[PDB]
Amino acid sequence: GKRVVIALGGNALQQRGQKGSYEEMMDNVRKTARQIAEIIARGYEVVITHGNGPQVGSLLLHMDAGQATYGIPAQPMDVAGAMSQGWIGYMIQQALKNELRKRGMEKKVVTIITQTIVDKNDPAFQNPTKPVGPFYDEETAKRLAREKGWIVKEDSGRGWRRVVPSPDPKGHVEAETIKKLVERGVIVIASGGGGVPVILEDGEIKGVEAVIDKDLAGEKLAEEVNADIFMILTDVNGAALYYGTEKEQWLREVKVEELRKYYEEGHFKAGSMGPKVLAAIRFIEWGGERAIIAHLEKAVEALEGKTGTQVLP
Amino acid sequence: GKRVVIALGGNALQQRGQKGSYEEMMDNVRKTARQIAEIIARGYEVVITHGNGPQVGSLLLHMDAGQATYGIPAQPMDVAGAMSQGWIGYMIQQALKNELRKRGMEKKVVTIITQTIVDKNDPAFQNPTKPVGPFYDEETAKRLAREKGWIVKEDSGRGWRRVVPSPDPKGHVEAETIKKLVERGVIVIASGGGGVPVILEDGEIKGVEAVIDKDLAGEKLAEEVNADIFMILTDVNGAALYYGTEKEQWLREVKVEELRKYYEEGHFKAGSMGPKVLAAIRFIEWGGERAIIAHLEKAVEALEGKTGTQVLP
Numbered sequence: 134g135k136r137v138v139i140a141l142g143g144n145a146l147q148q149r150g151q152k153g154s155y156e157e158m159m160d161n162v163r164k165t166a167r168q169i170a171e172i173i174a175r176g177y178e179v180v181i182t183h184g185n186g187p188q189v190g191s192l193l194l195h196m197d198a199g200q201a202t203y204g205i206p207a208q209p210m211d212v213a214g215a216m217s218q219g220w221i222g223y224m225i226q227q228a229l230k231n232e233l234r235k236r237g238m239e240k241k242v243v244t245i246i247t248q249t250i251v252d253k254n255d256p257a258f259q260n261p262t263k264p265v266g267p268f269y270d271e272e273t274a275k276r277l278a279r280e281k282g283w284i285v286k287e288d289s290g291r292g293w294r295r296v297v298p299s300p301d302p303k304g305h306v307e308a309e310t311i312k313k314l315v316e317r318g319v320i321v322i323a324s325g326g327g328g329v330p331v332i333l334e335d336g337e338i339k340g341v342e343a344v345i346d347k348d349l350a351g352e353k354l355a356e357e358v359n360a361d362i363f364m365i366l367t368d369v370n371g372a373a374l375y376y377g378t379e380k381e382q383w384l385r386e387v388k389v390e391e392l393r394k395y396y397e398e399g400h401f402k403a404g405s406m407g408p409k410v411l412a413a414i415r416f417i418e419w420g421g422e423r424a425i426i427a428h429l430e431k432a433v434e435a436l437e438g439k440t441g442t443q444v445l446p
Numbered sequence: 447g448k449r450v451v452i453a454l455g456g457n458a459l460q461q462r463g464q465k466g467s468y469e470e471m472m473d474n475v476r477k478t479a480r481q482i483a484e485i486i487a488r489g490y491e492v493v494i495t496h497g498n499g500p501q502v503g504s505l506l507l508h509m510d511a512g513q514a515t516y517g518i519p520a521q522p523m524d525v526a527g528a529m530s531q532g533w534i535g536y537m538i539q540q541a542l543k544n545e546l547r548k549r550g551m552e553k554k555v556v557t558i559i560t561q562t563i564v565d566k567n568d569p570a571f572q573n574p575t576k577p578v579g580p581f582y583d584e585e586t587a588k589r590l591a592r593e594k595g596w597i598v599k600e601d602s603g604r605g606w607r608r609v610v611p612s613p614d615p616k617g618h619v620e621a622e623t624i625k626k627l628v629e630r631g632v633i634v635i636a637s638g639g640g641g642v643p644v645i646l647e648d649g650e651i652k653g654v655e656a657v658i659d660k661d662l663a664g665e666k667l668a669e670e671v672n673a674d675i676f677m678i679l680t681d682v683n684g685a686a687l688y689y690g691t692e693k694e695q696w697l698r699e700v701k702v703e704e705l706r707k708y709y710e711e712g713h714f715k716a717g718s719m720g721p722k723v724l725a726a727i728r729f730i731e732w733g734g735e736r737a738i739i740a741h742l743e744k745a746v747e748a749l750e751g752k753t754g755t756q757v758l759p
């Protein structure tokens with residue numbers, strides 16, 4: 134069967150308005166796992182990645198409160214991303230191996246903790262723009278800046294929050310092992326959250342506090358495993374021109390040259406759809422057969438080419 | 447080369463007195479990685495596990511403070527164990543691959559998120575007695591007992607705590623994939639903290655809230671990967687008879703028949719050295735060639751048979 138990387142998004146774990154309690158996440162993950170299980174029953178070789186923004190944000194909230202109440206040290210963002218990969222990957226590997234056993238299918242399903250390499254001279258480290266963590270007042274946010282070297286900015290009028298770098302993913306430290314597992318039929322969950330951001334210097338891989346886009350990092354995983362198809366599943370069913378306006382037009386089959394023109398026109402917003410269109414464009418430019426942007430609830434119909442945005446060479 | 451499962455303990459990550467800051471843990475994991483890289487330079491096939499008691503403890507304190515301050519949901523103990531495997535695995539896989547890379551050894555090092563199967567009829571579930579989490583007052587602890595189904599007890603005069611089961615590990619969900627990676631020469635970190643505790647019910651894997659002893663779970667990982675040697679690294683250089691008294695004798699080479707008799711005499715305290723000697727006894731009874739209990743800082747000499755307790759058939 135064809136090999137597909139499926140990059141899950143927020144809605145695989147949390148619905149609009151949910152705080153992300155354990156029971157909420159267990160229900161959303163089981164719904165996700167039935168869609169993936171359908172795709173595995175159809176014969177596809179599946180590799181899974183996902184986001185972690187709300188989950189790393191909850192861990193940063195928790196550790197700021199722990200440090201204030203019990204005096205125990207808060208851990209840095211690379212550690213919070215590794216914690217998130219163990220959390221989310223445990224819930225997806227247990228629900229997907231259980232839904233495949235319910236279908237009379239025995240498969241091996243594992244999470245591999247993944248480090249994503251970026252260039253230490255990436256220009257994003259000179260200009261951090263992604264807001265993250267708790268909302269602080271001005272006084273606490275500027276004291277944290279002085280003491281820790283953080284950058285802060287007032288965020289949409291809700292308080293002050295750290296801003297961190299969003300560097301471009303170059304590749305994964307564990308790519309060789311990830312591909313070996315895929316080639317032997319294991320369903321691997323990797324690059325969770327975009328992976329832990331790391332740079333290489335003086336022999337050592339070292340964590341850095343940043344966010345890597347999970348669709349851009351997912352596209353690099355798709356190159357690394359030699360995937361045929363790269364599919365992004367989100368909470369809208371594709372990419373639209375003139376989104377939210379009276380001229381709104383949902384893209385269906387679109388050639389990559391046309392999608393690149395649409396991209397420079399600005400239709401795909403930078404905090405959201407822009408990087409998913411960029412990742413689909415890059416996968417086609419690398420040589421992939423098809424990239425897809427669709428809604429999680431239409432994963433299977435999308436994968437067959439019937440709905441969603443379908444990007445071709 | 448001989449295949450060895452190395453079961454690290456507290457001192458691989460924290461020393462006496464430390465709270466467990468990132469910088470403390472990064473320094474202790476670097477020291478651990480220099481020991482293991484020398485073993486790998488010597489041609490052994492290594493598999494690594496470790497404990498997670500202080501690190502799941504910190505996460506339970508952080509999430510009770512987070513839910514109390516920000517109203518975000520705390521997650522249950524199986525999820526906190528998964529978070530701990532991601533956090534500790536990422537640090538050891540980064541440090542160990544860095545020491546191998548600087549010494550001119552290119553080796554793959556990865557953490558697999560591991561679930562440890564226990565028997566749902568284990569008598570431990572009828573008698574929980576390991577205290578975990580924050581110290582509460584009696585009202586708060588008995589309200590949580592009513593609302594959540596917890597068992598609480600007053601712990602050593604410091605307040606009331608939840609008590610959980612400590613079931614015997616039977617095997618690991620991921621054992622076949624772990625062993626296939628070891629046979630391909632990947633250095634695997636697995637069963638961290640004893641693994642996420644899970645039962646099997648009607649074919650479905652379900653998490654439970656419990657602690658699984660990391661040395662007993664380490665010995666079952668050694669059975670599953672067909673290890674030759676099982677080596678526990680701790681903060682004392684072996685097991686002693688009549689520990690702390692005038693009759694004290696530190697065991698060097700010991701045969702399993704004698705060591706079972708000493709175990710029955712009660713020399714090895716149940717919350718510390720007892721499970722280490724039980725796990726060494728079990729590895730020799732399963733058919734292993736040698737089980738070792740030694741100090742972390744003397745790991746190479748101990749694997750060579752020159753120091754520490756050396757348990758033989």
Ligand SMILES: Nc1ncnc2c1ncn2[C@@H]1O[C@H](COP(=O)(O)OP(=O)(O)O)[C@@H](O)[C@H]1O
Binds near residue numbers: 366374404
């Ligand atoms: N041109 C566009 N077409 C479609 N959706 C768009 C567009 N521009 C912005 N969006 C937003 O992109 C959002 C999906 O991205 P995002 O919220 O980051 O989700 P995920 O967690 O799946 O990555 C949609 O809910 C939509 O509101």
Ligand SMILES: Nc1ncnc2c1ncn2[C@@H]1O[C@H](COP(=O)(O)OP(=O)(O)O)[C@@H](O)[C@H]1O
Binds near residue numbers: 454684687688713717
């Ligand atoms: N018979 C004994 N021989 C040696 N050490 C013992 C014995 N009984 C108890 N101990 C204690 O076991 C401790 C090591 O176990 P533990 O503290 O649980 O460490 P780890 O984190 O490595 O599992 C030693 O520091 C020692 O105080």
Ligand SMILES: [Mg+2]
Binds near residue numbers: 142404405
């Ligand atoms: Mg997004």
Ligand SMILES: [Mg+2]
Binds near residue numbers: 455717718
């Ligand atoms: Mg111990």
